[PDB]
Nucleic acid binder design. Structure first.
Ligand code: GCP
Ligand code: MG
Ligand code: MG
Ligand code: MG
Ligand code: MG
Ligand code: MG
Ligand code: MG
Ligand code: MG
Ligand code: MG
Ligand code: MG
Ligand code: MG
Ligand code: MG
Ligand code: MG
Ligand code: MG
Ligand code: MG
Ligand code: MG
Lengths: 62, 99, 83, 208, 622
RNA sequence: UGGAGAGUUUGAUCCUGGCUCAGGGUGAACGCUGGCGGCGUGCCUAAGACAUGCAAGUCGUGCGGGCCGCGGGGUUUUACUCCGUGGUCAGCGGCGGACGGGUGAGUAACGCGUGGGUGACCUACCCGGAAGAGGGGGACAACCCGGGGAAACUCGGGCUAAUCCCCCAUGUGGACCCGCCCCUUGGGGUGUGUCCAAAGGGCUUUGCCCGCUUCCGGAUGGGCCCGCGUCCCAUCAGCUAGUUGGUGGGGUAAUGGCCCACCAAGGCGACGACGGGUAGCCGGUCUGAGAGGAUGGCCGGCCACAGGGGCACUGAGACACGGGCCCCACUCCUACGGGAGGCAGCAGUUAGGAAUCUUCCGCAAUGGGCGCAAGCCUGACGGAGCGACGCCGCUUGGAGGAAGAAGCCCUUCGGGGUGUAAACUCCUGAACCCGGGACGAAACCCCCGACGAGGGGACUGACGGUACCGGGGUAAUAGCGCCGGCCAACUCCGUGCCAGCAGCCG
């Protein structure tokens, strides 16, 4: 099992995923994170601060 | 497809027969001599040894034997000839080996 | 046979050779018997060709062949001139 | 590198007047005079007493900001000082101060160290006759540091060498305002520079 | 440009692959389920030279299932040849390839092929060409023998005629027209000239005056008309039996456009403004990848058309369409028998590249350092049928999906998706025959064996009478209008219904850890006492059909448990709107195609849920 | 010239003690972002499978032929195609293909490291020295002929040349038995007996150049041996039949149970035999105050391997990476008769993977092979390309510019912050464009001298119209992480054990 970080996500039953390592002091037996922004894991929408975790492209300042 | 290391192969095969010939000859004669030395037939034992010696040395000339190898072959032949004879003996055909 | 030849050192666009004696069969940049000179084909410094003549002569006398390019450089430091 | 971006804003924060604009950071203006407090929404609040870390961070940052040098270049420069012979603190300054961009400022061919960088970098400076455009260039005892013959009469250079008639150039140096030549005589003694920097705390910064 | 890029497109089994195969032979004088199933499925470009003229040919498949292979050649090629089973006329998939040629503005000739077969009649083709697809055909030649004795071809225009002795194209050679046909010949020259009149005016005038114009200026006047897409020269022959093919090739070099004779295509710069791409070999590079192939022996092969510039082998280029830097590692030309590696590929030219890892069809390539323009590409189209796929034994699960990803990359009419409710992998294509060759491609090509089957449906449940209850606290539960909507304990037993276990919906709960367990046991009960009913997705469907078929189409919709909603025209045909349960809509596209002789289409969009016909449910508690 | 600690068990305390963090590092990978250059560096996984090209040849001054382009006239010339030379083609014969290049699978071992030993040995080409190169024969390809084949090509019969083979001679010398002297493991000498050599080619030719033979010495490279050093499990404690030793053989360059007969019953093991697991080893590298710990990609040295396994042949050397045989695995062509194949060479494809490049340029340099030489070959190599992968360097302006615009944030509604930051004035001038333009290349060769030394001449550049110099010349990319404590950096809003954060405390 693997944590899906970020507010909101788009993972479903055959979504392909990049696993990362890093556990979560809180979910037992979750030793891994999903790398947002890669394969079928979308970035995190509206994210503006820690954007490179959370795989979020730099938003346009039109 | 083709390299002419094929040549080197064609050639190895010729030499392989050439040396086979000289080598098997050297053993038939070396054997023959020790055999005769044991029967006590010293004129012909020494007679043959000389032939064997010649052929071994002849072989040292090119790739077939070389070196300490021929010398060794020779050494063991006359060590083995001289002694078998010596048990009966007298070195009749004074040829071949030192007084 | 054994050779007197240029081993490449220095760096990219910075050739600096060592004049070295070595079995012919080593790789060019490999182990070598003895160092005798060094050579910098671009003369970026005044001491750009050096050779230990009295050693090169030892090596020539025991049958080391020099490279064309090496010969040229030993000649130039008078390994070959005999008075 | 060289930062690029607001300066007499760390002329502040370090809380102590570096000289990043040369000429203005002398007017009733280096903001040290006006707003001698840190930038930002806070800055004029209760100062919380500094951690031992912050003490040194700041001291390190102070020195670095003075010369306009990247932290990678700085640490390198420093680690070199440490390996080098005798007092790491003093030596390290001497290496900072041996820099070309800074030598040029100490000669007053340029007003600010930023400026000196830009001058060096644009071919206007020459060391021992050949032209150098590497701010990081290390200047050695005995070097002639001049202004390029083609640059000799530029608006900025005459202004700046006009102000050098009058002034004394730091003891470890010589200057020839008429002919625009300078000589790096020896390495700067720890006292020759009145630096607002306890360099011993900078050594200690790099000890962690 | 001394260079002709031409597709061969036609109904199924009209003879394109054979035609092509003969073109490469004449121009030569100095494939798995395609076997099994007997069809063309993948087309490749191929070069040959006719009269010091470079001909690039794409032999296209006929089936709807592979429309994508036309929707593709019809882009990147400049001119088409449209074949006909002249014993059959214009068939429904001729109509299709035609309207595709229409939308890319593709100058074209026709080829009444199979003039040898029992029934084969040019006039069938001609009439039907005009009756069924609105075209203006122009008789450029005539035959010598009603079907069985079709022995030679009159060329009107040049007044000349050829007869073939064998069915081998090894004893051809000119003859004069015979006495008969000679009255028939004329009558077209003049009648071509009648038509050419509208193009040259020097012919217009020269017509009126009873003066037959010059051979070259007619050709130019015809050709001009072909390229303005107002005239469709018709040629005839038998590809099988080597009759009219050389003539056909001549006719390609006479009337079919060289890249200069067609508007150059358009693109969209990063700024945003449209712009034409000058077709200069020394301009920047712009180019369109239109096919990926996984080929041993060179690996991934990417076929491209160069519009502007000179694509030079051993460079880097930029896929503007997906912004990756790609490498042309070598460039390639497919001849009839071998593949020429070439150093470059200039404007107007097609080839294949190796290198190139990300680029797919429609994707645009430009120079390494060039104006990142994005070219008008290729056009979806959209899949009509879909099925659950799962492997017979899992572990093969990975092989299966890795493949479908490969395959959805080669061909973008094939999609893979995952039903969001029950996570089964849903595969979709352009027909039964499509999906069959895909599955039959997973076994042979990818060593993965799968089952296929109807997607199971997203059911719902609700109640049908209001209710009051005690959960041990009390609640009232009424229904609501179809499609309405809807404490934390109750939304939680809303998951599983009583009947099948799908979500409960469209109800109002009125209340009048500990709290949680009580709502959950209350509503769980309310739904039973409320006396429920299964709801099931209903799709709004609009199908499009020539009016011929309406009755039978509608009848079958009613037969699918539907409810028709109305019917308007859209252009030359007629639309029918209706609601039908998703369930009964399985394999609709291929039933529809049987009822409309492949002329119908349809689309489908979720609309609402609604209760069932009291037959299922029991037959659904199962 | 060298050494920092902090959070967390308690109501609180001290101690114990684990967990956790700050640092450095990497062949990296992934995310956001990305401007330049230099030097490095880039399949860590499937020692999986590989389309295609190239990676080892060269000598006509070893030899005889086929074909071609010429010169010079044969019947005057095309039909009998004749001499001379300059090309090409295989063949025969040499030297090279044992080096260079790849990889880390196996190997826990004299494999490696380190120091030694060989009276127990070898070393092609190179050098020094001595003495020869004198007689004769012969065959196999090429070539022609035929049978065979779809072809690959394959068999048979016959011709033939040489630096190919063979015999004979001379024996400077060498080998061998035996005896003698010295020496001391088989080292040096000596006597008689026996046994052993050789090849010619080219020129301007009674002289030069290249080769051939024997011996001695040198140099270089090797083989074999020994001391010591070389990971985890003892929940592996006993191991061993060529096993330990002897004798006599065989084998090899050479010692040796290396192999074989015979005899004896040994040999090894808690100082860890045997077994199982892991691993190529080192110079170094990373870390560390050090001692240590970890590692062994790149570069150098040694070893091993070349689809898996065995085997030998040729040879100075191989049990042979682009040589051979067989077995096995796998693939390819096929006319169904049979054939062919081995990227862990450079590129590249495909698969596996989080992930790793051009099917690039050039032999100008350095090095290698062959050649008298000219020169040929050289994916060694020198370069270019791609990748922020790494390190170093450089830019995105500089100086002026308000008690301080606007916007945006805070606000105790006076202000405060962004901020000299901008706007604005001057100044400079990355990129660009123009002109010029390298070093790296002087040898080999040629001429004088003697084809020595020494003097003189000629050719030669992939990178590259590149670096760099000169002249013009534009204000010209900035982003990423963090701001509860460790830890440098705080306010407002939204949110309300939800959404979410999280390395630990939380
Ligand atoms: N009598 C006759 N038959 C022909 C002729 N050309 C093709 N055919 C027949 O139709 C078959 C059509 O095969 P093909 O030529 O591949 O047609 P196609 O249209 O390419 C098939 P798809 O559309 O599936 O690719 C031929 O084998 C033959 O059976 C023709 O000239 N004369
Ligand atoms: Mg955060
Ligand atoms: Mg016998
Ligand atoms: Mg049909
Ligand atoms: Mg077809
Ligand atoms: Mg069919
Ligand atoms: Mg306790
Ligand atoms: Mg990017
Ligand atoms: Mg040892
Ligand atoms: Mg023995
Ligand atoms: Mg041997
Ligand atoms: Mg291993
Ligand atoms: Mg320590
Ligand atoms: Mg392999
Ligand atoms: Mg190979
Ligand atoms: Mg993959």
């Amino acid at each position: 099992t693997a944590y899906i970080p970020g507010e909101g996500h788009n993972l479903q039953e055959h979504s392909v995923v990049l696993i990362r390592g890093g556990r979560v002091k809180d979910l037992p037996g979750v030793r891994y994170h999903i790398v947002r922004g890669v394969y079928d894991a979308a970035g995190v929408k509206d994210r503006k601060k820690s954007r490179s975790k959370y795989g979020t492209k730099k938003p346009k300042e039109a | 497809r083709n390299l002419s290391a094929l040549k080197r192969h064609r050639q190895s095969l010729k030499r392989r027969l050439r040396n086979k010939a000289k080598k098997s000859a050297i053993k038939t004669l070396s054997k023959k001599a020790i055999q005769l030395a044991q029967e006590g037939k010293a004129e012909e034992a020494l007679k043959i040894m000389r032939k064997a010696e010649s052929l071994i040395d002849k072989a040292a000339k090119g790739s077939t034997l070389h070196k300490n190898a021929a010398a060794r072959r020779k050494s063991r032949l006359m060590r083995k000839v001289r002694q078998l004879l010596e048990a009966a003996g007298a070195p009749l055909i004074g040829g071949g080996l030192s007084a | 046979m054994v050779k007197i030849r240029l081993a490449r050192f220095g760096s990219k666009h910075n050739p600096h050779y060592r004049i070295v004696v070595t079995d012919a069969r080593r790789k060019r940049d490999g182990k070598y018997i003895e160092k005798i000179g060094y050579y910098d084909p671009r003369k970026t410094t005044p001491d750009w060709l050096k050779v230990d003549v009295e050693r090169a002569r030892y090596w020539l006398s025991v049958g080391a062949q020099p490279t064309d390019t090496a010969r040229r450089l030993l000649r130039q430091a008078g390994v070959f001139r005999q008075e | 590198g060289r930062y690029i971006g607001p300066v007499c804003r760390l002329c502040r924060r370090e809380g102590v007047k570096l000289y990043l604009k040369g000429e203005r950071c002398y007017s009733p203006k280096c903001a040290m005079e006006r707003r001698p407090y840190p930038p930002g929404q806070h800055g004029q609040k209760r100062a919380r007493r500094p951690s031992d870390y912050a003490v040194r961070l700041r001291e390190k940052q102070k020195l670095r900001r003075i010369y306009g040098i990247s932290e990678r270049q700085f640490r390198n420069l420093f680690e070199e000082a440490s390996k080098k012979k005798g007092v790491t603190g003093s030596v390290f300054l001497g290496l900072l101060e041996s820099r070309l961009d800074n030598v040029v400022y100490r000669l007053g061919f340029a007003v600010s160290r930023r400026q000196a960088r830009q001058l060096v970098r644009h071919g206007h400076i020459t060391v021992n006759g050949r032209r150098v455009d590497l701010p990081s260039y290390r200047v050695r005892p005995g070097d002639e540091i001049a202004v390029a013959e083609k640059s000799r009469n530029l608006e900025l250079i005459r202004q700046n060498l006009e102000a050098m008639k009058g002034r004394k150039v730091g003891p470890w140096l010589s200057l020839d305002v008429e002919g625009m030549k300078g000589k790096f005589l020896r390495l700067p003694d720890r006292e020759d520079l009145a630096l607002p920097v306890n360099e011993q705390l900078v050594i200690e910064f790099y000890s962690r | 440009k001394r260079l002709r890029n031409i597709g061969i497109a036609a109904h199924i089994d009209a003879g394109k692959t054979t035609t092509t195969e003969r073109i490469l032979y004449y121009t030569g004088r100095i494939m798995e389920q395609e076997r099994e199933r007997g069809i063309t499925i993948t087309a490749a470009v191929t070069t040959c030279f006719w009269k010091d003229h470079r001909i690039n040919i794409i032999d296209t498949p006929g089936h709807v299932d592979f429309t994508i292979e036309v929707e593709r050649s019809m882009r990147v090629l400049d001119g088409a040849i449209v074949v006909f089973d002249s014993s059959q006329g214009v068939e429904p998939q001729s109509e299709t390839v035609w309207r595709q040629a229409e939308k890319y503005k593709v100058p074209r000739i026709a080829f009444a092929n199979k003039m040898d077969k029992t029934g084969a009649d040019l006039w069938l083709v001609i009439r039907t060409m005009q009756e069924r697809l609105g075209a203006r055909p122009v008789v450029m030649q005539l035959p010598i023998g009603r079907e069985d004795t079709f022995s030679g071809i009159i060329d009107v225009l040049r007044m000349k005629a050829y007869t073939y002795g064998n069915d081998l194209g090894t004893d051809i050679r000119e003859i004069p027209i015979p006495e008969e046909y000679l009255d028939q010949a004329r009558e077209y020259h003049e009648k071509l000239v009648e038509v050419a009149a509208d193009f040259d005016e020097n012919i217009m005038l020269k017509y009126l005056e009873g003066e037959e114009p010059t051979e070259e200026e007619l050709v130019a006047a015809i050709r001009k008309g072909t390229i303005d897409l107002k005239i469709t020269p018709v040629f005839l022959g038998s590809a099988l039996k080597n009759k009219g093919v050389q003539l056909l090739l001549d006719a390609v070099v006479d009337y079919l456009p060289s890249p200069l004779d067609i508007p150059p295509i358009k693109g969209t710069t990063p700024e945003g403004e449209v712009v034409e791409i000058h077709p200069d070999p020394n301009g920047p590079l712009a180019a369109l990848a239109f096919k990926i192939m996984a080929d041993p022996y060179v690996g991934r092969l990417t076929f491209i058309r160069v519009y502007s510039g000179t694509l030079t082998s051993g460079s880097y280029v930029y896929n503007t369409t997906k912004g990756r830097k790609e490498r042309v590692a070598r460039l390639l030309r497919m001849h009839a028998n071998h593949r020429e590696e070439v150093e470059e590929l200039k404007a107007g030219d097609l080839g294949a590249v190796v290198g190139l890892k990300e680029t797919i069809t429609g994707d645009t390539l430009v120079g390494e350092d060039a104006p990142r323009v994005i070219l008008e590409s290729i056009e979806v189209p959209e899949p009509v049928i879909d099925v659950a796929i799962e492997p017979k034994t899992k572990a093969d699960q990975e092989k299966l999906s890795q493949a479908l990803a490969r395959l959805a990359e080669e061909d973008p009419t094939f999609r893979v998706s995952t039903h969001p409710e029950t996570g089964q992998t849903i595969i979709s294509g352009m027909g039964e025959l499509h999906l069959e060759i895909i599955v039959d491609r997973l076994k042979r090509e990818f060593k993965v064996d799968a089952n296929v089957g109807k997607p199971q449906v997203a059911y719902r449940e609700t109640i049908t009478k209001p209710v009051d209850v005690e959960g041990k606290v009390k609640i009232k539960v009424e229904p609501l209008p179809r499609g309405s909507g809807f404490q934390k304990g109750i939304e939680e037993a809303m998951q599983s219904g009583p009947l099948i276990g799908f979500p409960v919906v469209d109800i109002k709960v009125t209340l009048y850890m500990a709290f949680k367990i009580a709502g959950s046991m209350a509503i769980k009960e309310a739904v039973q006492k409320g006396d429920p009913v299964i709801l099931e997705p209903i799709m709004r469907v609009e199908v499009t059909t020539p009016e011929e078929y309406m009755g039978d189409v509608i009848g079958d919709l009613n037969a699918r448990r539907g409810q028709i909603l109305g019917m308007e025209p859209r252009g030359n045909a007629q639309v029918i709107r209706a609601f039908v349960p998703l369930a009964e809509m399985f394999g609709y596209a291929t039933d529809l195609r049987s009822k409309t002789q492949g002329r119908g289409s349809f689309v489908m969009f979720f609309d609402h849920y609604q209760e069932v016909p009291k037959q299922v449910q029991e037959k659904l508690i199962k």
